């Protein structure tokens, strides 16, 4: 046990040993970006691949070319924290070495006249952080992986649902990574048609003719030949034995049945058959037959032989005739009938027809047609069947060559045609479109490489255009390359792509789940409305690869998936999952990662299979799965086993205790809502857990993990200094490690990110130990919510539907109080009238509102502010304003007139009260820094001095020097002092950060981990809540009616186990309080940890006295227990745990009504549930408006709480009002509340006068409609 785990050991109720630990959860991001940016000597991945794909750039004439040498990434201007503060992208400069080689015209082509080698700046590449995130414009973002259709060839059918009859129509689609699409389809007349890029169909034979295939060659490729001879004045079939098995058969020695088995007579073996001429009459010729004497073609290819034709060849002396084999079951004339409907007879005609279908309305020339056909599929510039696409193509058509080819050829097209014809005949099957072997994962590295190659092509066009000019004596490579297109491409992808998403940052689990998210949408994917049922379904290949539970509930159902716990992407982008080998009947601890294609062959047992001490299966027939179908299989036929019991579910589903007792519809909700939990003031571990909490806490990156072991030299709320062990020093190293903690930093969802130390000075630490706990972490365990005392009973209708009744104590102990940090900005710009000024001289505002402001007009740090309070004072110059005559008279009476400037200041939003915790001032380079900005600059300089001095002192104390530290401090000073690159016209920016403490209140959303969500209805007094015989009231009362119809029984089991765990914790607390002997404490702890037949062997004898005391202290608030998914605690274990803690075995206590003192007539299930506070707070959702801003064109109220907008009275509301008959209410809604400009002012004045009458007019939207219809040249008018 590690020290952090030794501090609080969680009891494990699992029974199956784990042979494979859960791998790093953020590998799918880090590995992809490493592939992108790392240098590849083989040049197959990333920037090197893109550069070698575009370069060398060759001029059209041949004068010169630009060649690629190498690339490197420079040093970032700012770090991640500095980029987030300033609002800039964290990135590295791309520097590429290129040589412009200029050839000699007089010399033969290829003579190196000159070379010019130089480094070129080719843009700025955004960098991935240590946790798999990007910082774009100061915002943390995650690029989501895509599940797309693999490149290659796919054979499909319409399933007999297009034509009037069944007639199942078959098609084959070739889809590349880049380039046009190729389609081969059957019509209901059994003819083969070709489509290029989804346009008008053409007969398939055309594509063969453009490839130089004669009609006879086509027939030879697509048909077998039955031959005929004239032997001794008799007709001659060449017999193929397999075909025969309506006429009299030859071979008089072995006569077969005549006009009425085959194998017995074929056993002897003859090569001679005699047949009627009528057998020839129906056949179709296979060759073109010419006569030298006549000079004409007696019979053409693909022509039906006739009697006169037979006579003509008889006179011509030809004795052998071959025709095509054609049947109705195994062989078909489809290619012959296609040739019949084909009007093309030569390569040029086919090229011309392809040009007409490509580019209609253009005069076809031979050269243009040839160039078009070459560019469509056989040009590497415009076609790319990628390596994955090539491998899938070759596997489909059974080709074992051209592994590195990226373009189609004759063999590929002909093999696709043959396979489609074969599928029509009956040999072969169509492809499963939703099979995970046909769907590929495309991650950040691939998409970045694609966009970077796009930028490279953009600049390559201009480079070729310039090199074609010729005047290159004074041209250097950096004068040829414009990096702005490449930068535009990369910023487009990283900031405006659909898959570049604003990071989910409510809790660590939200971040981990977001980084492990796979979308079917995005560029090159599906669309929400156009996606069908089949793609949204759970395929049998999702086992161990995609979680069947975690998926968004809504229009996105089935299109967004979560990676499973052990899922991985192979080198080709296909998901694979680990399995344990079964060798010689024993289950080996060797692991093989199998993909969907490889999985189908084998018989794979489940992790629940019983095992013997020798490693083999106990039962003779085991439950396994093969080809996606489950069943019972012999023990000797099992080839693989599942590595873990949580292999099929994702991390969020793996965090749900007793998941096997929950219906999947509710497990979906539980997994989704675990990601919306808001961290609280005090993180509390779950009493009932699954064991994956530590993994999420460590792999999220929110915690501070010891890079090296040692002894904690110094601990503080903001800094941890570790004295490293003597065995783990880099020779000549200071010997200390410094961990600076994040303290009250805003997250993407305006929550609080705070790191709290969990170590003491002098405490030994090993590698991987948790030194500080991030948000929603407790001693290295994920702590999303709080443990609540729960009673399942109705309480006077306050838990009606899904309502939740909460005790006042829960509010008093601040158990669900949350900190929300909000950022506000005041931007002083430059206007035509003048420059906006930030100052405390605010007109028409007294000294009451200026108390919290300083001389510079900015609020003090630590100022408690309420709604409407001024944070930053700002005055905007205003123009001359016309005064009404009454205002002129009022000014004449009282002469005051001070209206030079207008108060446009930053104020706290209404219903927001908090504390100012940070103020930042950004000033444009060349604008005077006010007193406050100078104060912040001095404070930052002093803090940098102090931090550098302390760090230097500790590192020199560990070691036991001026130029290097002076350089570091000079760099820090330059970063602090310099001006800020702000948006044009912006003179100054002041950002104020407000910390708001939000307490639980009616309207807040609370949930468990089983889909049991609800809204708080009442905050009950403690004396009114149900209580037990010992006087302890419950904390939350939940409705028992929500359990049976929703089939989430894991919540009841969790309640029972939580009651047991809290009882055992109370027993431990009692033993500590009475100061019993440590031997008794050890005996009790060992009894607790030995309960059940579990896989955990915790020996308290190996723990020191201080360790036992620490463990007992950490078990005071309840014993944490682990119940893994599908390997959980049985009911017998729960009852034994209840009996140990001296609690009823049924989990039901006798409760009394606090209002009356009377016992409830039945026992009530009382226990402890882990409850969460979701980020759906009534503070952010309560809106109201009477009158406000209006739209510019429609003159209707704006929309949104941010704009103080109004609710939309849609069509269905109008229908409801019409059904009621409320004509006057409807007219109010249409006219005087939305867009009757005169009517709404009159209505406001009437209400102020207390008259309550309206004078409706014409809505402005109708006037707009009239104007647009008139603008369409249509006279629309109103008649009286």
């Amino acid at each position: 046990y590690s020290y952090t785990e030794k501090k609080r050991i969680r009891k494990d109720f699992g029974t199956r040993p784990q042979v494979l630990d859960i791998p790093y959860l953020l590998s799918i991001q880090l590995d992809s970006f490493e592939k992108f940016i790392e240098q590849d000597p083989e040049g197959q991945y990333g920037l090197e691949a893109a550069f070698r794909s575009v370069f060398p750039i060759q001029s059209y004439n041949g004068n010169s070319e630009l060649q690629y040498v190498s690339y490197r990434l420079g040093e970032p201007v700012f770090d991640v924290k500095e980029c987030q503060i300033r609002g800039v992208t964290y990135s590295k400069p791309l520097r590429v070495k290129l040589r412009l080689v200029i050839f000699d015209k007089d010399a033969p082509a290829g003579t190196v006249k000159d070379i010019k080698e130089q480094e070129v700046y080719m843009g700025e590449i955004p960098l991935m952080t240590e946790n798999g995130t990007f910082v774009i414009n100061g915002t943390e973002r995650v690029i989501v992986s895509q599940l797309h259709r693999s490149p290659g060839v796919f054979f499909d059918s319409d399933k007999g649902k297009t034509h009037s009859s069944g007639k199942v129509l078959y098609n084959a689609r070739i889809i590349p990574y880049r380039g046009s699409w190729l389609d081969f389809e059957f019509d209901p007349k059994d003819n083969l048609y070709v489509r290029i890029d989804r346009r008008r169909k053409l007969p398939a034979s055309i594509i063969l003719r453009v490839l130089g295939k004669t009609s006879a060659e086509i027939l030879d490729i697509f048909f077998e030949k039955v031959n005929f001879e004239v032997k001794d004045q008799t007709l001659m079939m060449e017999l193929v034995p397999e075909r025969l098995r309506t006429f009299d058969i030859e071979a008089d020695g072995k006569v077969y049945v005549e006009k009425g088995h085959i194998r017995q007579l074929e056993k002897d073996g003859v090569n001679f058959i005699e047949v009627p001429v009528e057998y020839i009459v129906g056949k179709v010729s296979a060759k073109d037959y010419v006569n030298e004497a006549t000079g004409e073609l007696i019979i053409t290819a693909n022509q039906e032989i006739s009697l006169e034709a037979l006579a003509n060849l008889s006179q011509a002396g030809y004795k052998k005739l071959e025709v095509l084999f054609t049947n109705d079951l195994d062989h078909g004339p489809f290619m012959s009938e296609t040739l019949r409907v084909d009007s093309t007879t030569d390569r040029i005609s086919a090229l011309v027809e392809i040009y007409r279908m490509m580019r209609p309305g253009e005069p076809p020339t031979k050269e243009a047609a040839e160039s078009l056909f070459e560019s469509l599929f056989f040009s590497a510039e415009r076609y790319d069947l990628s390596t994955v696409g090539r491998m899938k193509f070759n596997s489909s058509i059974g080709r074992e060559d051209a592994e590195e080819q990226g373009t189609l050829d004759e063999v590929d097209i002909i093999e696709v045609m043959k396979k489609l014809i074969s599928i029509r005949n009956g040999k072969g099957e169509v492809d499963d479109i939703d099979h995970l072997g046909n769907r590929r994962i495309r991650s950040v590295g691939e998409m970045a490489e694609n966009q970077f190659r796009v930028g490279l092509v953009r600049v390559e066009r201009a480079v070729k255009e310039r090199l074609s000019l010729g005047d290159l004596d004074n041209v250097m490579p950096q004068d040829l390359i414009n990096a702005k297109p490449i930068s535009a491409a990369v910023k487009e992808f990283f900031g405006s792509s659909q898959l570049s998403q604003f990071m989910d940052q409510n809790n660590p689990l939200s971040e981990v789940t977001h980084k492990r998210r796979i979308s079917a949408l995005g560029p090159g994917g599906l669309t929400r409305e156009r996606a069908g049922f089949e793609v949204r379904d759970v395929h049998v290949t999702h086992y161990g690869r995609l979680c069947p539970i975690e998926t968004p509930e809504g229009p996105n159902i089935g299109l967004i998936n979560s990676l499973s716990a052990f899922a991985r992407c192979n080198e080709y982008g296909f998901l694979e999952t680990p399995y344990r080998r079964v060798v010689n009947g024993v289950v080996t601890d060797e692991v093989d990662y199998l993909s969907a294609i490889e999985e189908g062959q084998f018989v794979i047992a489940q992790a629940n299979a019983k095992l013997t001490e020798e490693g083999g299966f106990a039962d003779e027939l085991v439950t396994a799965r093969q080809k996606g179908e489950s069943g019972l299989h012999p023990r000797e036929h099992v080839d693989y086993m599942d590595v873990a019991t949580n292999q099929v579910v994702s991390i969020a589903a793996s965090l749900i205790p007793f998941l096997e007792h929950d219906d999947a519809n509710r497990a979906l909700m539980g997994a989704n809502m675990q990601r919306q939990a808001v961290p609280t003031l005090r993180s509390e571990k779950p009493l009932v857990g699954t064991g994956i909490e530590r993994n999420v806490a460590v792999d999220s990156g929110v915690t501070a993990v010891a890079k090296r072991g040692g002894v904690i030299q110094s601990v503080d709320a903001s800094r941890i200094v570790v004295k490293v062990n003597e065995e783990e020093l880099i020779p000549g190293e200071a010997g200390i490690d410094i961990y600076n903690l994040t303290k009250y930093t805003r997250s993407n969802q305006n929550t609080c990110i705070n790191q709290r130390p969990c170590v003491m000075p002098g405490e030994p630490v090993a590698r991987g130990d948790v030194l500080a706990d991030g948000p929603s972490t407790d001693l290295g365990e994920l702590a999303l919510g709080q443990n609540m005392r729960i009673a399942f009973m109705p309480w006077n209708g306050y838990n009606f539907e899904d309502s939740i009744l909460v005790s006042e104590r829960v509010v008093q102990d601040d158990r669900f109080t949350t900190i929300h940090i909000q950022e506000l900005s005041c931007v002083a710009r430059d206007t035509k009238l003048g420059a906006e000024e930030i100052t405390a001289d605010i007109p028409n505002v007294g000294e009451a509102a200026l108390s919290k402001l300083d001389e510079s007009g900015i609020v003090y740090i630590g100022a408690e502010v309420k709604g409407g309070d001024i944070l930053v004072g700002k005055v905007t110059p205003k123009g001359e304003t016309q005064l009404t005559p009454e205002e002129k008279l009022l000014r004449a009476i009282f002469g005051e007139k001070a209206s030079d400037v207008k108060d446009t200041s930053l104020r706290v939003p209404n219903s927001v009260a908090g504390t100012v915790i940070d103020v930042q001032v950004f000033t444009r380079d060349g604008v005077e820094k006010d007193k406050r900005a100078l104060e912040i600059e001095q404070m930052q300089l002093k803090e940098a001095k102090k931090d550098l001095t302390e760090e230097f002192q500790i590192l020199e104390g560990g070691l036991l020097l001026k130029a290097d530290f002076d350089k570091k401090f000079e760099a820090k000073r330059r970063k602090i002092t310099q001006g800020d690159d702000l948006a044009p016209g912006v003179l100054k920016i002041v950002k104020v950060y407000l910390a708001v403490k939000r307490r639980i209140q009616p309207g807040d959303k609370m949930a468990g981990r089983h889909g049991n969500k609800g809204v708080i209805s009442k905050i009950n007094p403690v004396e009114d809540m149900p209580y037990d015989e010992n006087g302890q009231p419950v904390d939350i009362v939940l409705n028992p009616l929500g359990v049976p119809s929703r089939m989430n029984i894991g919540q009841i089991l969790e309640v029972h186990l939580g009651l047991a765990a809290k009882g055992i914790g109370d027993k431990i607390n009692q033993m500590i309080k009475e100061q019993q002997e440590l031997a008794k404490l050890r005996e009790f702890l060992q009894k607790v940890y030995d309960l059940g037949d579990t896989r955990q062997r915790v020996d308290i004898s190996e723990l020191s006295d201080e360790d036992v005391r620490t463990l007992a202290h950490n078990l005071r608030a309840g014993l944490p227990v682990a119940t893994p998914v599908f390997d959980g605690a049985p009911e017998s274990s729960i009852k034994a745990m209840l009996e140990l803690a001296d609690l009823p075995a049924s989990g039901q206590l006798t409760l009394f009504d606090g209002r009356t003192g009377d016992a409830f007539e039945r026992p009530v299930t009382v226990g402890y549930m882990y409850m969460l506070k979701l980020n759906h707070l009534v503070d952010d959702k309560m809106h109201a408006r009477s009158t406000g801003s209006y739209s510019l064109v429609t003159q209707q109220p704006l929309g949104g709480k941010a704009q103080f907008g109004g609710q939309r009275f849609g069509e269905m509301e109008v229908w409801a009002l019409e059904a009621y008959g409320a004509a006057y209410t409807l007219q109010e809604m249409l006219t005087v509340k939305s867009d009757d400009v005169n009517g709404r002012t009159k209505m406001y004045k009437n209400i102020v006068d207390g008259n309550h009458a309206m004078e409706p007019g014409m809505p402005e939207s109708f006037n707009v409609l009239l104007k647009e219809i008139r603008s369409l040249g249509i006279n629309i008018e109103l008649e009286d």
Partner: peptide, 10 residues
């Protein structure tokens, strides 16, 4: 056969 004015102009 075509609607693009560019192609008609060419």
């Amino acid at each position: 056969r075509t609607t693009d004015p560019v192609r008609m102009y060419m």
